[PDB]
Design an enzyme around this catalytic site. Structure first.
Site, mmCIF file in Angstrom:
data_model
loop_
_atom_site.group_PDB
_atom_site.id
_atom_site.type_symbol
_atom_site.label_atom_id
_atom_site.label_comp_id
_atom_site.label_asym_id
_atom_site.label_seq_id
_atom_site.Cartn_x
_atom_site.Cartn_y
_atom_site.Cartn_z
ATOM 1 N N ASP B 45 8.984 1.417 24.004
ATOM 2 C CA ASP B 45 8.737 2.829 24.276
ATOM 3 C C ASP B 45 8.592 3.083 25.772
ATOM 4 O O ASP B 45 9.024 4.119 26.277
ATOM 5 C CB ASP B 45 7.487 3.312 23.536
ATOM 6 C CG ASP B 45 7.691 3.385 22.036
ATOM 7 O OD1 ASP B 45 8.856 3.490 21.598
ATOM 8 O OD2 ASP B 45 6.685 3.344 21.294
ATOM 9 N N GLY B 46 7.983 2.133 26.474
ATOM 10 C CA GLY B 46 7.829 2.230 27.914
ATOM 11 C C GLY B 46 9.171 2.217 28.619
ATOM 12 O O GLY B 46 9.394 2.969 29.568
ATOM 13 N N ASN B 121 5.701 12.003 26.439
ATOM 14 C CA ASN B 121 4.474 11.647 25.737
ATOM 15 C C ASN B 121 3.353 12.639 26.016
ATOM 16 O O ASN B 121 3.008 13.455 25.160
ATOM 17 C CB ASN B 121 4.026 10.236 26.122
ATOM 18 C CG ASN B 121 4.698 9.165 25.291
ATOM 19 O OD1 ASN B 121 5.574 9.455 24.477
ATOM 20 N ND2 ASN B 121 4.291 7.916 25.492
ATOM 21 N N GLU B 122 2.787 12.564 27.216
ATOM 22 C CA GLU B 122 1.678 13.434 27.583
ATOM 23 C C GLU B 122 1.521 13.566 29.092
ATOM 24 O O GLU B 122 2.109 12.809 29.865
ATOM 25 C CB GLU B 122 0.368 12.917 26.982
ATOM 26 C CG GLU B 122 -0.256 11.756 27.745
ATOM 27 C CD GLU B 122 0.550 10.478 27.634
ATOM 28 O OE1 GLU B 122 0.906 9.900 28.684
ATOM 29 O OE2 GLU B 122 0.823 10.047 26.494
ATOM 30 N N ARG B 147 -16.409 19.280 32.106
ATOM 31 C CA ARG B 147 -16.888 18.212 32.977
ATOM 32 C C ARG B 147 -16.814 16.874 32.250
ATOM 33 O O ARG B 147 -17.376 16.714 31.167
ATOM 34 C CB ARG B 147 -18.320 18.473 33.446
ATOM 35 C CG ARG B 147 -18.873 17.376 34.349
ATOM 36 C CD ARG B 147 -20.345 17.592 34.667
ATOM 37 N NE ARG B 147 -20.903 16.510 35.475
ATOM 38 C CZ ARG B 147 -20.968 16.523 36.803
ATOM 39 N NH1 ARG B 147 -20.506 17.565 37.482
ATOM 40 N NH2 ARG B 147 -21.493 15.494 37.454
ATOM 41 N N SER B 157 5.567 14.270 19.708
ATOM 42 C CA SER B 157 5.949 12.870 19.563
ATOM 43 C C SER B 157 5.018 11.966 20.362
ATOM 44 O O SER B 157 4.956 10.760 20.129
ATOM 45 C CB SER B 157 7.398 12.655 20.009
ATOM 46 O OG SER B 157 7.546 12.909 21.395
ATOM 47 N N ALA B 161 0.480 8.264 20.745
ATOM 48 C CA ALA B 161 0.233 7.429 21.915
ATOM 49 C C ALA B 161 -1.198 7.576 22.425
ATOM 50 O O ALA B 161 -2.155 7.337 21.687
ATOM 51 C CB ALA B 161 1.223 7.768 23.016
ATOM 52 N N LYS B 164 -3.738 9.750 20.370
ATOM 53 C CA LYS B 164 -4.396 9.192 19.192
ATOM 54 C C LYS B 164 -5.616 8.357 19.568
ATOM 55 O O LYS B 164 -6.643 8.407 18.891
ATOM 56 C CB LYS B 164 -3.417 8.345 18.379
ATOM 57 C CG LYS B 164 -4.034 7.744 17.128
ATOM 58 C CD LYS B 164 -2.999 7.041 16.277
ATOM 59 C CE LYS B 164 -3.641 6.382 15.071
ATOM 60 N NZ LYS B 164 -4.628 5.343 15.470
ATOM 61 N N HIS B 222 4.218 7.592 32.239
ATOM 62 C CA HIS B 222 3.898 6.337 32.913
ATOM 63 C C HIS B 222 3.529 6.555 34.378
ATOM 64 O O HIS B 222 2.785 5.767 34.963
ATOM 65 C CB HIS B 222 5.071 5.358 32.815
ATOM 66 C CG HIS B 222 4.800 4.030 33.450
ATOM 67 N ND1 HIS B 222 3.723 3.243 33.101
ATOM 68 C CD2 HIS B 222 5.462 3.351 34.417
ATOM 69 C CE1 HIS B 222 3.736 2.137 33.822
ATOM 70 N NE2 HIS B 222 4.780 2.176 34.629
#
Ligand SMILES: [N-]=[N+]=NC[C@H]1O[C@@H](n2c(SCC(=O)NCCc3nc4ccccc4[nH]3)nc3c(N)ncnc32)[C@H](O)[C@@H]1O
Ligand SMILES: [N-]=[N+]=NC[C@H]1O[C@@H](n2c(SCC(=O)NCCc3nc4ccccc4[nH]3)nc3c(N)ncnc32)[C@H](O)[C@@H]1O
Ligand SMILES: [N-]=[N+]=NC[C@H]1O[C@@H](n2c(SCC(=O)NCCc3nc4ccccc4[nH]3)nc3c(N)ncnc32)[C@H](O)[C@@H]1O
Ligand SMILES: [N-]=[N+]=NC[C@H]1O[C@@H](n2c(SCC(=O)NCCc3nc4ccccc4[nH]3)nc3c(N)ncnc32)[C@H](O)[C@@H]1O
Lengths: 262, 263, 259, 259
Positions: B45-46, B121-122, B147, B157, B161, B164, B222
């Protein structure tokens, strides 16, 4: 047009109910409780849930309106002090309609169908052990207190308290959350809440016990000899009548975060 | 049609790459790493994440394919043994296309130009050292004063990662939305936060606005770099989507099943 | 000495029980279900809890031994086949005693005291569960949800874990309170985090409107009516275990949840 | 007696500091080398620095926390009561002790030992954080995620709180382990639940592939290379507070999170 008003039970909800019926007396709105087009709920979310299941057979021709007597609810977003404005705004029949997704609860033993506005929980009548099936395939085997399948608008209800995610009602989906799951070597569960889109079927199948306490919204009874519990985003949708912009996230903020002007 | 292949770097991946290239040579397939129509990622995935950002300017004309050399990935479905079956289904064009939503991240600075980023991803925002304190503004309306360690906005999707691990909900990639999860919120009287993960639909804008410190450690998938003099960080579901070449029918929930429960 | 043996009820448990008593009388061992000093539980953790509640009045004179007929438990640790050597060591009186803390549950309305080995939960009798959590005669929060759970250190690996509670070693004399689906909003703000209380700390649950609750102590749950106060504190009484082998607590936790 | 005052940095702390020193102009001498009483002004972060500044003589130093901003758990007293503290300090007060966390880092050289008032955390140096959690020379789990947090009882209301950990009363001599974004898949199975370890229990974190870690102790965070083992246990050393009035821990928890 035709309309009706439901009440919680206390003097406050009954008094305000009589006030609005009087106000609509100066406008062409036939008060009807068997075939209305505008259902008004006075009290709380629980009162709204009752009004929903009271007319769940005619969700097509009904626009719901909520009024909270006590604290602010997610379905009851109108204040009692704004009842005067509500009457005048409802008279013209001018309002945009907003539709929220619903949950279709199907129990297989004779096939029964229930429409959930908030959620549909499944507990045991001792230990609760079932098998979670996603679109005719094995996903996991749950063991704990129960499982909770929630609607988008219902995410702020029981789903929230169970650690589920808050989901905007514009999204047509359903969310599955665990209830006191025991994650041991034998019974491994995902732990995380699961959000399913439309055309997705979540089937809860018994393992050794067939008696399960199936609940839908504010109604909880015991089903017997259950073979399968299906879940899917119902094609049926509940319609609301908006006269004023009151964002869903605002209702979330005013409920859980803070309400400085109240 | 034009294609290219990215490799993890190890022997097994490079070896599989060379043989696939030779495999495509027996058909009407041209190798082009400048303007490919098909991008094949071999590794994990990376590695798939790197191939995505390598061609994030041509996502509209590219169908991605993932091959895992090790454990099963959510983007790298294909087994190395299925590489032979893959090279033939591609050449004939015998495949359909599936699309996943993406996350748009806009970083505005002091008046200097803004910078936009796409995430598969995010995208996360953390401090530059001290406490992380920002105001969360949803659709031009203040929601909470956060804070803690940071905030994570994930793609559908991308929910399987980092999301979760942070306690986020697992969403099906067909759903066009984005999910906001907390990263160690103090959640007290002064800094009251919702706690629950928030799932935002399309056309919704989540604005992260500084309170004191204007320096933030912004990460996209990443990549993670430091941004200074930040005035606003905006999150919204991008109009652009990543396209996947579909041959088989690997359920998203089965991939979740095989990864976290049992394989 | 004066011993006794409890059974789950199944054929395997009853057979092993008779096979144990037979080997028991072979040595200096008087069977006594009235004044026991050694209680052997055969079956599971549920069977163990029954043997515990059967002798709450004389817990300071009894060492417990658990034998699992079913799956491995945190109480029933001995194997069905390891009952052979268990008879020998128990007769010579060589075993060491290990003490675990207990939870005291008092219902107020004439009081009513209860002792829990695992935990004690309080839920509503149908409607919403709304109470006031009072810590040491001082209000802490107004809870509204499914209920609350006060867990023993040894009971943390049970219902407490499922509720997001922490796992604490049974050598720590304390009690842990966890939430059961707290709504946690403006008018009902709760801490969220599990709270661990030491000895001499009293947690008092006080009703707001409805005074009918489903109070549950371990394996039993009673629908108490007209409840004015529910007090929780670490009991002065402790349960003693006959230690023969060396089975670490964290090792038992590993075998259960980590494979 | 001898004393000293630390400041946060802002004008609110320095001004209040100078006002208090003039108040002892009693039989109190200002000595920041060998003090008997240390007063911190600012916040919990300021108090942490004052702790590590005088961790050499914790046994002969009583700490007092004053918060110029919001209420803290170590910085208890509001500047409005600063004057009453001066007269009371010049010596009518008791002494309360909180447990500490001992952190041992071994290399592959010597070893390094640290004391934590709040907690000690271990994260990666860039890539994925993968370690083996060993409890009392026995393997427990193989963790993979962001990191692990070992917290003091008094430190539970800090980072431990935000990480979903349990809140422990500082009279309980123990330590708590919490996870940081654990992936918790089938290959890297973790307990998930926070773990509370008593005294004489050693939690060992051992590297799997990478031996470089970002180890933090309270407010300090540095990179440790070639790490062979990271050991956690409850320290025998304690921090002493100068108790004046009665400000309960749970009431202090209430005023921070509930209100
Ligand atoms: N309004 N009304 N009536 C039913 C609705 O209450 C919502 N609900 C429920 S109903 C499920 C249940 O088993 N409740 C047991 C006792 C209870 N019921 C409550 C209802 C509201 C708030 C707290 C409650 N505790 N529980 C909870 C809970 N813990 N936190 C938040 N909301 C809950 C649920 O969405 C249902 O639709
Ligand atoms: N042995 N025995 N009997 C009583 C013990 O049940 C343990 N328990 C309980 S009892 C609460 C209850 O009645 N839950 C309804 C469903 C249920 N009951 C169970 C009993 C044992 C294991 C799982 C259960 N799930 N629930 C749970 C749960 N979710 N996860 C883990 N352990 C639970 C609790 O420790 C109590 O001491
Ligand atoms: N005061 N001070 N400085 C040091 C103390 O901060 C505490 N801490 C930390 S330090 C861990 C870290 O490096 N976090 C990233 C940056 C950061 N530091 C913070 C300090 C307070 C609140 C939020 C923070 N985020 N994080 C958090 C967090 N999320 N919530 C609560 N308390 C935290 C920790 O107990 C440490 O002892
Ligand atoms: N190359 N590469 N991978 C980048 C991906 O790592 C995923 N991720 C990350 S990246 C955030 C980070 O810097 N965390 C601290 C160091 C780290 N990196 C990890 C990567 C994978 C698994 C654990 C990690 N911990 N953390 C976590 C975490 N705790 N659990 C699960 N997945 C994580 C995230 O989705 C990101 O897109």
């Amino acid at each position: 047009m035709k309309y009706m008003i439901t009440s919680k039970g206390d003097e406050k909800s009954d008094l305000l109910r009589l006030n609005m019926i009087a106000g609509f007396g100066e406008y062409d709105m036939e008060y009807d409780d068997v075939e209305p087009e505008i259902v008004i709920s006075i009290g709380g979310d629980g009162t709204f849930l009752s009004a929903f299941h009271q007319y769940e057979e005619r969700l097509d021709e009904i626009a719901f309106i909520g009024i909270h007597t006590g604290h602010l609810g997610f379905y009851a977003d109108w204040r009692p002090a704004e009842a005067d404005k509500l009457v005048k705004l409802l008279a013209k029949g001018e309002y945009q309609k907003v539709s929220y997704p619903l949950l279709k609860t199907t129990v297989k033993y004779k096939e029964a169908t229930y429409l959930a506005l908030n959620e549909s929980t499944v507990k045991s009548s001792g230990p609760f052990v079932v098998d979670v099936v996603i679109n005719d395939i094995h996903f996991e085997r749950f063991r704990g207190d129960g499982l909770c399948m929630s609607t988008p608008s219902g995410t702020t209800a029981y789903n929230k308290s169970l650690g589920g995610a808050l989901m905007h009602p514009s999204i047509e989906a359903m969310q599955l959350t665990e209830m006191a799951s025991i994650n041991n070597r034998v019974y491994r569960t995902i732990g995380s809440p699961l959000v399913f889109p439309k055309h997705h079927v979540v089937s809860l199948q018994p393992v050794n016990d067939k008696d399960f306490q199936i609940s839908v919204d504010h109604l909880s009874i015991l089903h017997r000899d259950v073979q399968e519990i299906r879940y899917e985003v119902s094609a049926k949708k509940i319609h609301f009548a908006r006269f004023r912009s009151f964002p869903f996230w605002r209702r979330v903020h005013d409920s859980f975060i803070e309400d400085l002007e109240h």
